[PDB]
Design a protein around this ligand. Structure first.
Ligand SMILES: CCS/C(=N\c1ccc(CC)cc1)NC
Length: 435
């Protein structure tokens, strides 16, 4: 695997030992061969689990999720997928790693797709080797792969709202369940229904993941209600997965707005990953997987692939060349390579709106390409009446940095800035000039 050119896809089934068994062997060989190596973790939780599997080995942890006193002589760096992509975009020089290892290489967030694009392009140019570790490579059509122990698979109607009757099997269970819901708001309703029935529930989503995940180890629970973020290496000591088989899909309409379409079917890769949370202990056969819908290729036309192109167009590769998306996932978007390339100043605004502004990639691009500077928030208020953001059935209001009370009405509407209470609160703070 460890030779210039060559991208290897390590596709062992979920729980086969890619992270705890194969990864340390690869790292030992890389260090023996003096290969400058990067290990890409999807989340800070996976970064912490990787330190445990790699303990002793000289690895430089470029994350605050690990508390290690480095020696300065490490030739292996470990960082999150987003950090790698972020450093590539920023003026900081990123080493030209001879070996690029991506754990949970199926992650569909824009920064993970862009990282795959950049790395596979360097490999195609003959400059580096790469290893993509995932049980579900792009384009997988099997939602029921192998497991460490047999799983009972059952197609059943799964509630997506609070219920009074008709789903006794859900609450009659005496074990631990991980339940995948299509959104934070849908999970809040199911969590409330289960709590009212006497169950102890933990909720996980992208924003709360590190803090709330600790509770799955620190306390006794009956249910974990989670969004699709738990498909990325989140390990639970559970005996059942309930899977709605649904997700929200960001869709760019007329090149002018982003809506959260659906809920709609998950991909086969997402279903296999959700199911893959259980059946991991060869001594506990019979873990259950209850699923409530079929799979579909909902990654085609999904905004994340277009956002990945906006990122790759603004990353230096060599002269005017631009990194292409990883070949198996390149047809998911219809885009011209280079169409989102920004001049140095607008590029800096683009980066700062994502990094400091915490805006979605698509929204950051619309603001930066319009020649608007980072601190100029007049665009949050001068959109059409149909772009009015609503808070509890009434127009949302903020005090501008000037001291004026105004209705939140952005020139570009992206549904992700107000898809839950937390997102709308962060967007209100941005529109007010508070970051
Ligand atoms: C706070 C009261 S309004 C204010 N600025 C303006 C000025 C003009 C207009 C358009 C009539 C709106 C707003 N600053 C504090």
């Amino acid at each position: 695997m460890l030779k210039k050119k060559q991208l290897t896809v390590l596709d062992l089934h979920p729980g086969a030992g890619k992270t705890r068994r194969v990864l340390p062997e690869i790292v030992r060989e890389a260090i023996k061969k003096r290969l400058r190596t990067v290990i890409l973790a999807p989340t800070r939780v996976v970064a912490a689990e990787m330190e445990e599997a790699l303990r002793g080995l000289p690895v430089r942890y470029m994350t605050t999720a690990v508390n290690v006193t480095h020696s300065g002589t490490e030739i292996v760096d470990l960082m999150c997928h987003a950090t790698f992509t972020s450093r590539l975009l920023q003026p900081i020089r990123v080493p030209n790693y001879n070996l690029n290892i991506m754990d949970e290489a199926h992650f569909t967030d824009p920064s993970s797709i862009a990282a795959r694009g950049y790395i596979s392009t360097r490999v195609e140019m003959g400059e580096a080797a790469a290893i993509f570790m995932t049980a579900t490579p792009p384009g997988t059509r099997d939602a029921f792969p192998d497991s460490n122990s047999p799983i009972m698979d059952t197609e059943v109607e799964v509630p997506e709202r609070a219920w009074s009757s008709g789903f006794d099997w859900v609450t009659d269970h005496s074990g631990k369940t991980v339940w995948f819901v299509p959104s934070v708001r849908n999970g809040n309703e199911i969590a409330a229904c289960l709590t009212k029935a006497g169950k102890r529930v933990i909720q996980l989503s992208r924003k709360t993941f590190e803090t709330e995940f600790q509770k799955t180890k620190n306390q006794e629970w009956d249910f974990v209600i989670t969004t699709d973020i738990s498909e990325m290496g989140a390990n639970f000591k559970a005996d059942r997965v309930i899977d709605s088989r649904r997700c929200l899909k960001p869709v760019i309409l007329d090149g002018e707005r982003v809506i959260l379409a659906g809920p709609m079917p998950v991909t086969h890769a997402s279903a296999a990953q959700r199911r893959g949370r259980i059946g991991r202990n060869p001594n506990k056969p019979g873990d259950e997987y209850m699923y409530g819908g079929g799979c579909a290729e909902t990654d085609e036309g999904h905004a994340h692939w277009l956002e990945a192109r906006m990122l790759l167009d603004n990353i230096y590769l060599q002269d005017g060349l631009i990194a292409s998306l990883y070949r198996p996932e390149a047809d998911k978007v219809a885009a011209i390579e280079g169409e989102f390339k920004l001049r140095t100043e607008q590029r800096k605004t683009f980066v700062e709106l994502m990094k400091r502004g915490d805006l979605p990639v698509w929204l950051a691009y619309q603001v930066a390409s319009a020649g608007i500077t980072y601190t100029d928030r007049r665009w949050c208020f001068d959109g059409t009446t149909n772009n009015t953001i609503m808070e509890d059935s009434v127009p949302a209001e903020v005090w501008t940095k000037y001291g004026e009370k105004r209705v939140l009405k952005p020139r570009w509407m992206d549904a992700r800035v107000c898809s839950d209470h937390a997102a709308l609160k962060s967007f209100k703070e941005f529109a007010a000039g508070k970051r």
